[PDB]
Nucleic acid binder design. Structure first.
Lengths: 197, 167, 127, 106, 122
RNA sequence: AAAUUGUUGAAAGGGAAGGGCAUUUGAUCAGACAUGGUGUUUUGUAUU
RNA sequence: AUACUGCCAGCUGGGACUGAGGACUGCGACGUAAGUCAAGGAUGCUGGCAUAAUGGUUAUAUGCCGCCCGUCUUGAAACAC
RNA sequence: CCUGAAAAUGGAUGGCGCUCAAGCGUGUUACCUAUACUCUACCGUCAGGGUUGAUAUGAUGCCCUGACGAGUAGGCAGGCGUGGAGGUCAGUGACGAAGCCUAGACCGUAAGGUCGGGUCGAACGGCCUCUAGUGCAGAUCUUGGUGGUAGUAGCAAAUAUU
RNA sequence: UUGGCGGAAAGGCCUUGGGUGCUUGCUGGCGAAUUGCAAUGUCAUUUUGCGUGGGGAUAAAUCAUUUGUAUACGACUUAGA
């Protein structure tokens, strides 16, 4: 439907989001996933750390450089889950994985564009209240990701600029409303209301 | 030789068809297709344009006009499957339409040799189009914004789902 | 101007090639049925070459017909055209590869006189 | 004005298939905006075009078209089955097709 | 024919790492080059535009000899002679041009569209 | 003649290659339009 | 009254695939009359092209499949020959 | 559900992943798709039948049919090719036979047959029959020829040459 | 033309002003056929060229020689108008 769909990864369960995004990419939709460090996984943090250590234990014995490459960044973890959900060894799977892009935080191309959510992947809607969960950034830094703090700093700066922009947009909308309330309740507005608009 | 002659031989006559039992019956149109109604032409040179449905021709075709003065669609016929019927209807009373038919839309197809490798309108056609269009305009102007609606060309917008849309 | 006949349908327009004729040069493309005990082709495993079967047989009303609907008829001379002289609509002549140039032009002229269609009226002459 | 689209957008998802065998004679089409078989029943019988472009001119155009038709619905989620005069080239899994509004019945 | 030959610094001119200096083959090739230059001069060619337009070496009948191996065995010791042929041609520019017409075929709707565009534009 | 080579040309090539179904793309190619029927403003004038 | 079951030789639509056969023959239906018909298998109308456009072959790409044949063997892709 | 619950390359509810599940027990329903079932076209097999007509048909000729179709070892039947032989085509051919090459064409389910284009140089084929030293992918098959390995192992004992 | 702001992959956002074109905000005048009853009916993109013009400066690598802080060979530290 859209050229690119940009997904706020915050609050999203990694598996549900990966399944949704893999289906979309195979269906032909370009997807950019931001805030990967704020993705959620159900279950306790210690549990998912044990799961990642089980993943880490697997490596090609005679040469560890041929073995599974245990990527540590939250974006790379999400990408690994999605590549597992895509038939990545065929040209169609490669095309879908090319359609996908995933980042930590929100880079400059996408901090100025709209970001959406997938309610069938959101933890607040899916997980039962009182269930423990972990954050991909916390797990990643526990297992060797080196940029929790750089991303947090850039995120604070970006959120500051975006909050200033939102304050300006609110002011403009409120002033538009104040100025055009005089032109409101007019005959044209009444006809539109009768028509349903 | 290789094949002198086959002793059994085929027959020379060409077979005649069996007496088929398929009688042609008049077409039944949908209840939304009544003369004087506004149709959106879905295909052709004038695709998406709003025209006025005038008469059901004998060869299952619908006689329509723009009116030409309003949107440039002339007195043509269109396939009833390639239009969308709209609830908007002009009073087709006041315009005689009995003249036009299949023989009226006679073309004298070009010959095979006459090939336009690189590279007009009949006067009776243009005058009767003027008459039909003047009657249609006198009717149309009684309803506000209808002439401009017919001048506008229908298009699908982002979020326009025709399976829920009402025409 | 031609006999209304059923549209000529070919069930299998592909050539039934012998198994491993692509693998080895000693194995020709001429079809041979695999008689091996473990043969995947003989056992009709999925993803393997199809084998010729009588279910592929052509409709008897259209069998042996050319694309034009004629049945091709190898001719060597005018006496060989004489059999077709009355069946212009169902038989087409094919001049034998062995016919010399002058005899070939004689056959072509006689077939043009009798309206017989020739399936190779361009051999042994330049374009 | 700027919109001339007279068709609905769709995606060619895949061929009709089981887990391990596909059928190129039937294509699965998702119609954008449609998410139920009840809503997809509108598009039954509607014509579909896969429009693509080649680098070589054929008959005065560099654009080629493969026509087809929505035959039935597929599943519970608004996907439909479509049949094309030539099977879709299988590189178009996820490519855009145009579901026209004719033959119209409204 | 380079497998398990040594590397050299003089292959960088050609992008490879394995290059060699076949003195005997080079001598044969340049002798045939001299012969071809003589033939072209006799034919009256340019001798400065001349370039090796064709060169082709293929295998010749082998010359057989014997080598002797442990435990009283005899193996072959073959020469691998070559037929070398070459043709020198005077250089020239891209003379060819004016490709095929590819006459067009339009339908009635295409012809009408072209006519309408020609009318609308000025 | 084949195996096996050289050159040219055309193609693919992310740890084989080859194959089946289906399409697409590029090449290449066969199938009524002289005719058992009507008829004509003469292509170069037993009729064209 | 509605459910819910069952029946209708009840009505109204929207789609798809197929069109075998080819010189009268049959069984029926239509105010019980010459005729007609949806009754022992598709006809009617219309358009574009008349060409590599359809199609064939061929090479490649893509989707899904596809283990190396022969043999002995209960069992072979076999780290069996 | 947890404890009980320890094995060696790294590792498998098939994988990813899943926690009011995408887990477990249960209950409506919708949907997906086998070479199965229903209905059509066509192929073949089997069978039960029709058919004596003044020419234009060698009567399992033409036709109505209904059912059916897996297959090793094995049986049987219809055919396709090869070398010779008897008849015939008063068959093809130095104006080009036979051979050979050709991601050219047609026919046949196939065995294969026919043709277009190159090469060439003296014989060859269709049909009805007869005959057999009659069809190859293998047998560590035979005899010739040829590969990759591979411009590789190597050409280093006996003092040594300039 | 005037302020900037934006470094996470900034390559995007207004404005300061002068010029020009449309304005469906409300009312008129002319044109559209014939593409014939549909045929996507053709409208957006990592490159270049005997070519045209708003402008710009005339570099290195490699082989050969040398080196020994290197070295099986390639490579590698070096030097040489």
């Amino acid at each position: 439907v859209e050229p690119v769909v940009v997904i706020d990864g915050k609050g999203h369960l990694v598996g549900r989001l990966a399944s949704v995004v893999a289906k979309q990419l195979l269906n032909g939709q370009k997807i950019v996933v931001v805030r990967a460090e704020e993705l959620n996984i159900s279950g306790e943090f210690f549990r998912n750390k044990l799961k990642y250590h089980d993943f880490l234990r697997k490596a090609t014995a005679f040469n560890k450089t041929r073995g599974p490459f245990h990527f540590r960044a939250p974006s790379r973890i999400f990408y690994k889950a999605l590549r597992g959900m895509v038939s990545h060894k065929t040209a169609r799977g490669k095309a879908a994985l090319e359609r996908l892009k995933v980042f930590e935080g929100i880079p400059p191309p996408y901090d100025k564009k709209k970001r959406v959510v997938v309610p069938q992947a959101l933890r607040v809607l899916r997980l039962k209240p009182g269930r423990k969960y972990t954050t991909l950034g916390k797990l990643s830094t526990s297992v060797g990701w080196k940029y929790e703090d750089v991303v947090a700093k850039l995120e604070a700066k970006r959120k500051v600029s975006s909050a200033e922009y939102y304050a300006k947009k609110r002011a403009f909308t409120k002033k538009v409303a104040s100025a055009n309330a005089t032109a409101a309740e007019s005959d044209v507005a009444k006809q539109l209301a009768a028509l349903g608009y | 030789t290789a094949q002198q002659a086959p002793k059994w031989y085929p027959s020379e006559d060409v077979a005649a068809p069996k007496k088929t039992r398929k009688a042609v019956r008049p077409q039944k149109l949908r209840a939304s297709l009544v003369p004087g109604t506004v149709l959106i032409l879905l295909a052709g040179r004038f695709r998406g344009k709003r025209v006025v449905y005038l008469k059901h021709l004998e060869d299952n075709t619908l006689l329509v006009t723009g009116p030409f003065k309003v949107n440039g669609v002339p007195l043509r016929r269109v396939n009833a499957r390639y239009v969308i019927a709209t609830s908007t209807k002009v009073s087709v009373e006041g315009v005689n339409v009995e003249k036009f038919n299949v023989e009226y839309f006679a073309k004298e197809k070009l010959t095979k040799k006459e090939k336009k490798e690189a590279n007009e309108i009949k006067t009776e056609r243009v005058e009767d189009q003027k008459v039909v269009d003047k009657a249609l305009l006198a009717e149309i102007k009684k309803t506000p914004l209808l002439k401009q609606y017919l001048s506008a060309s229908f298009s699908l917008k982002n979020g326009d789902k025709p399976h829920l849309l009402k025409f | 101007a031609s006999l209304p006949h059923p549209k000529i349908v070919k069930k299998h327009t592909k050539k039934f090639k012998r198994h491993h004729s692509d693998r080895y040069h000693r194995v020709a493309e001429n079809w041979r049925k695999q008689k091996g005990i473990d043969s995947v082709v003989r056992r009709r495993f999925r993803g393997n070459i199809s084998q010729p079967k009588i279910g592929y047989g052509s409709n008897k009303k259209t069998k042996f017909l050319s694309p034009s609907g004629h049945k091709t008829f190898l001719v060597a001379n005018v006496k060989d055209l004489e059999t077709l002289t009355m069946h212009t609509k169902t038989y087409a002549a094919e001049i034998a590869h062995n016919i010399s140039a002058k005899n070939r032009v004689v056959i072509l002229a006689r077939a043009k006189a009798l309206g017989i269609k020739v399936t190779n009226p361009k051999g042994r002459l330049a374009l | 004005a700027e919109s001339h689209r007279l068709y609905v957008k769709g995606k060619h998802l895949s061929y009709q298939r089981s887990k391990r065998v596909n059928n190129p004679n039937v294509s699965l089409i998702k119609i954008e905006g449609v998410a139920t078989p009840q809503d997809a029943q509108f598009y039954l019988g509607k014509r579909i075009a896969y429009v693509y472009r080649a680098s070589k001119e054929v008959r005065g155009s560099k654009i080629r078209v493969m026509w087809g038709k929505v035959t039935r619905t597929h599943g519970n989620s608004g996907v439909v089955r479509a049949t094309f005069r030539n099977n879709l080239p299988a590189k178009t899994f996820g490519a855009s097709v145009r579901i026209f509004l004719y033959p119209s019945n409204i | 024919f380079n497998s398990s030959i040594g590397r050299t610094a003089q292959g960088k001119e050609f992008g490879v790492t394995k290059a060699r200096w076949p003195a005997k083959s080079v001598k044969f090739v340049q002798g045939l080059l001299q012969n071809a230059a003589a033939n072209a001069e006799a034919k009256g060619l340019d001798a400065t535009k001349l370039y090796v337009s064709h060169i082709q070496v293929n295998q010749a009948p082998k010359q057989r000899r014997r080598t002797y191996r442990a435990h009283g065995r005899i193996n072959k010791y073959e020469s691998s002679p070559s037929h070398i042929e070459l043709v020198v041609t005077e250089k020239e520019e891209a003379v060819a041009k004016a490709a095929e017409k590819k006459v067009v075929r339009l339908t009635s709707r295409q012809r009408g569209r072209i006519a309408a565009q020609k009318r609308i534009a000025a």
